[PDB]
Amino acid sequence: AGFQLNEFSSSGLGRAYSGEGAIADDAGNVSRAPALITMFDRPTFSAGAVYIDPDVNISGTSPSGRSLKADNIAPTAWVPNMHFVAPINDQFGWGASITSNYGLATEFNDTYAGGSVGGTTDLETMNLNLSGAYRLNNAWSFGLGFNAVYARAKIERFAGDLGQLVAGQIMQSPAGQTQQGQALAATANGIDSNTKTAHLNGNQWGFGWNAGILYELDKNNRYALTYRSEVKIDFKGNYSSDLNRAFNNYGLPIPTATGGATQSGYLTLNLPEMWEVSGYNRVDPQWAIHYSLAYTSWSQFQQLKATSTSGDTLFQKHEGFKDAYRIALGTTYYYDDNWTFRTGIAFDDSPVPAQNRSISIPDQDRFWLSAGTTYAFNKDASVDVGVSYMHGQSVKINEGPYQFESEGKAWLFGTNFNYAF
Numbered sequence: 001a002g003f004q005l006n007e008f009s010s011s012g013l014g015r016a017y018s019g020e021g022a023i024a025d026d027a028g029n030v031s032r033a034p035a036l037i038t039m040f041d042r043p044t045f046s047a048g049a050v051y052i053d054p055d056v057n058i059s060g061t062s063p064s065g066r067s068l069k070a071d072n073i074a075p076t077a078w079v080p081n082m083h084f085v086a087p088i089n090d091q092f093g094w095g096a097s098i099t100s101n102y103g104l105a106t107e108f109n110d111t112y113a114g115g116s117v118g119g120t121t122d123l124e125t126m127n128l129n130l131s132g133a134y135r136l137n138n139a140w141s142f143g144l145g146f147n148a149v150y151a152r153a154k155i156e157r158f159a160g161d162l163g164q165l166v167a168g169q170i171m172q173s174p175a176g177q178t179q180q181g182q183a184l185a186a187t188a189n190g191i192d193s194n195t196k197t198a199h200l201n202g203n204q205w206g207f208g209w210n211a212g213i214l215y216e217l218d219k220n221n222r223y224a225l226t227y228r229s230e231v232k233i234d235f236k237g238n239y240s241s242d243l244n245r246a247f248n249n250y251g252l253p254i255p256t257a258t259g260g261a262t263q264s265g266y267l268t269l270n271l272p273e274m275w276e277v278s279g280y281n282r283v284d285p286q287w288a289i290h291y292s293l294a295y296t297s298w299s300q301f302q303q304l305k306a307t308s309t310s311g312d313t314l315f316q317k318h319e320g321f322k323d324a325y326r327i328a329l330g331t332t333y334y335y336d337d338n339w340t341f342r343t344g345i346a347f348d349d350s351p352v353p354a355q356n357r358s359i360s361i362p363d364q365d366r367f368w369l370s371a372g373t374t375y376a377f378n379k380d381a382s383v384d385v386g387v388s389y390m391h392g393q394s395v396k397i398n399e400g401p402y403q404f405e406s407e408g409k410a411w412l413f414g415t416n417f418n419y420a421f
């Protein structure tokens with residue numbers, strides 16, 4: 001799922017996020033579907049956090065006989081969540097919440113070899129939704145939400161061995177047979193591994209809305225169709241490139257050189273839209289079943305091109321992602337007043353068209369398996385605890401002169417606190 005994450009609740013995690021938009025057993029879900037609010041008698045609160053601990057790795061060798069082995073580049077994270085749904089009147093009621101739909105954090109060492117294309121890339125995301133719902137007849141329920149999306153990103157690449165490859169390349173030719181090519185090559189074979197090759201950094205707020213639909217057969221069965229729009233973040237950050245201002249103009253496909261001087265960069269982060277369709281079926285007094293099919297247009301994520309005050313290009317990477325689907329199915333078992341339990345499986349096809357593959361966004365079809373429990377205290381309180389094992393598919397990624405190979409697994413763990421009036 002590119003750099004998109006759906007950890008909005010701990011009860012959600014427990015069921016590998018299925019039926020979401022059709023399950024309102026906690027305020028956690030109104031975030032997915034605005035229409036879910038029309039399902040709450042009383043004011044409900046809930047806030048928790050998801051503990052993400054990935055295990056991605058890179059392996060490989062550089063033409064410079066160097067090691068491209070990038071061990072565990074994915075850092076543990078904490079994605080917390082806060083929700084609040086509350087009735088206004090029998091046909092109307094609003095809600096609010098703080099969630100994070102997107103995120104990314106891959107980091108190698110400044111002395112990595114494939115460091116040209118792998119060094120440090122982070123993305124902090126925080127969606128603030130304020131949705132309102134309107135019931136209609138005994139089955140339909142429309143919902144709408146507004147979103148302010150704060151982001152903090154900081155890209156940073158360094159020169160790995162390219163200077164050495166760059167050098168050899170020159171000398172390996174006629175150029176090398178000249179005090180200049182010999183000089184032009186000496187300059188190149190000098191570049192230490194940790195020479196900041198590019199630094200983009202800036203934070204901004206983005207805006208988007210999201211509508212919802214709810215149609216039910218009765219208090220036990222329903223289906224949903226939701227829509228979360230695209231979000232075009234226009235940053236205004238800082239650009240720094242320690243490469244002398246001489247490497248400039250030869251058109252070497254190298255990120256503009258400032259000379260270590262911080263210039264004023266511009267970037268546009270495109271957060272893909274999401275459509276989703278899920279259903280919920282309680283077939284017994286204890287059993288229930290939910291499933292969903294999501295489609296995210298990663299088509300909208302084409303590149304990341306930086307640009308100066310006067311409009312000239314500094315940094316630029318082609319993503320050319322494409323759309324993709326997520327699929328999920330799970331069950332909820334209502335034991336007694338107290339105990340509740342969940343399980344689930346899911347599968348999402350990566351949007352990265354194998355070829356545009358990149359070691360900074362080591363993505364690979366992911367597989368979810370989750371289990372969780374809930375324990376209500378008295379019809380007004382209840383704590384959530386969820387866990388999920390995620391695994392991917394080893395891919396081959398040819399970038400720059402280099403060729404890598406990344407495999408990755410991740411284990412999840414959330415716990416939310418519920419309260420009502």
Ligand SMILES: CCCCCCCCCCCC[N+](C)(C)[O-]
Nearest residue numbers: 123153200201202235237267360
């Ligand atoms: C001046 C803005 C500087 C921030 C640059 C934006 C970085 C967004 C990171 C998310 C995309 C991840 N990727 C493809 C670059 O690895």
